Design a protein around this ligand. Structure first.
Ligand SMILES: Nc1nc2c(ncn2[C@@H]2O[C@H](COP(=O)(O)OP(=O)(O)OP(=O)(O)O)[C@@H](O)[C@H]2O)c(=O)[nH]1
Ligand SMILES: Cc1cc2nc3c(=O)[nH]c(=O)nc-3n(C[C@H](O)[C@H](O)[C@H](O)COP(=O)(O)O)c2cc1C
Ligand SMILES: [Ca+2]
Ligand SMILES: [Ca+2]
Ligand SMILES: [Mg+2]
Length: 320
């Protein structure tokens, strides 16, 4: 259950983006307060990415058994970027002092599709030497055929022995099972996440009752209108200081609404008569970086363009 509070000036599209996202419709009635709760399915569009351990996943059905997934932790350890290793066999980690007889035991485990737990010397991208308490585990489908391979690494400085060895093997095995369950859950479509949408009033008259819905907030949506420079300036002048006055460390996502009007003839003409111009993307991006927003997203409640990405990043900011 995630609570999401949407704040911003009057008539910028706060209520419309909530209704269009929950009921696929489109309404002007100044909202005092309204609740909205919709079930969102997190399908990586995950719990597998939240696992902060050194592990990778490969595909034995593809030539040379390439890496199809690599954790953030694995990237920080091996000093490799994702694009550099995604799709390549994990043998690049090996080097001169790497015991080849141990590598053979790994090869036999993959060929026979079994589990294996070994210790070997691997190398980072810059050539940093470290011991690897490595555990390999095949991931079978519902039929019983091996679909993937899980490789869990426990980096160290020396070759662990006795109790230290027994402790480490225990950890990487328990870790592998967690990954295995996280992978199966991903294929099933993950778990449904209840999203609480709290619509607030933008009028100045409701400035006193508005912070009453701020407690227990997991993520804020500060909205402004792309065709209203006044609402854009209010983000720095009003909405950001107000949110931070009650919620000092709550994830804020800046949202530019009414995207379909930025490329509208009559709309731009209306703004030119008042000597104004629609808010541009770098302008909106500079505002998000200034107020420390985790993401800047533009959307249209009317055409639903970028509308789903807004609430997807809202959830992602909470789960990550
Ligand atoms: N073309 C276009 N118009 C929009 C869009 N979203 C909102 N509008 C218009 O802007 C007006 C603002 O709608 P609301 O969502 O009710 O305004 P609000 O942000 O909720 O402001 P408050 O009700 O005071 O809190 C609506 O009457 C729509 O006509 C959009 O995505 N595209
Ligand atoms: C999922 C998975 C993860 C692996 N992780 C490592 C690793 O971290 N370090 C390493 O030296 N080898 C790792 N290996 C083994 C190598 O990718 C490779 O299979 C092994 O070196 C044998 O290669 P070869 O058959 O060409 O001799 C992993 C293998 C798999 C399937
Ligand atoms: Ca079979
Ligand atoms: Ca008044
Ligand atoms: Mg409203």
């Amino acid at each position: 259950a995630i609570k999401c509070v949407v704040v911003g000036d009057g008539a910028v599209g706060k209520t419309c983006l909530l209704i269009s996202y929950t009921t696929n419709a489109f309404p002007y009635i100044p909202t005092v307060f309204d609740n909205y709760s919709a079930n969102v399915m997190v399908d990586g569009s995950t719990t597998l990415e939240r696992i902060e351990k050194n592990f990778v996943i490969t595909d034995p059905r593809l030539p040379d058994n390439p890496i199809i997934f690599a954790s953030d932790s694995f990237l920080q350890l091996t000093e490799y970027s994702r694009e550099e290793i995604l799709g390549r066999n994990a043998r690049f980690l090996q080097g001169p002092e790497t015991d080849r007889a141990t590598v053979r035991k790994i090869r036999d485990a993959i060929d026979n599709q079994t589990e294996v737990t070994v210790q070997l010397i691997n190398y980072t991208k810059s050539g940093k030497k470290f011991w690897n308490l490595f555990h390999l585990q095949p991931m079978r489908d519902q039929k019983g055929d091996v679909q993937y391979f899980i490789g869990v690494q426990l980096d160290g400085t020396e070759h662990v022995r006795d109790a230290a060895e027994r402790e480490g093997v225990m950890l990487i095995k328990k870790t592998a099972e967690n990954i295995d369950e996280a992978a199966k859950e991903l294929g099933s479509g993950g778990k449904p996440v209840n999203l609480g949408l709290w619509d607030t009033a933008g009028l100045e008259d409701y400035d006193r009752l508005r912070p009453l819905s701020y407690p227990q907030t997991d993520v804020f949506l500060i909205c402004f209108s792309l065709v209203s420079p006044a609402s854009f300036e209010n983000v720095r002048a009003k909405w950001y200081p107000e949110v931070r006055h009650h919620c000092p460390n709550t994830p804020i996502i800046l949202v530019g609404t009414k995207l379909d009007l930025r490329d509208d003839k009559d709309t731009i003409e209306k703004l030119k008569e008042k000597k104004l111009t629609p808010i541009t993307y770098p302008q909106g991006l500079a505002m998000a970086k200034e107020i420390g927003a985790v993401k800047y997203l533009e959307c249209s409640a009317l055409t639903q363009r970028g509308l789903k990405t807004v609430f997807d990043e809202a959830i992602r900011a909470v789960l990550c």
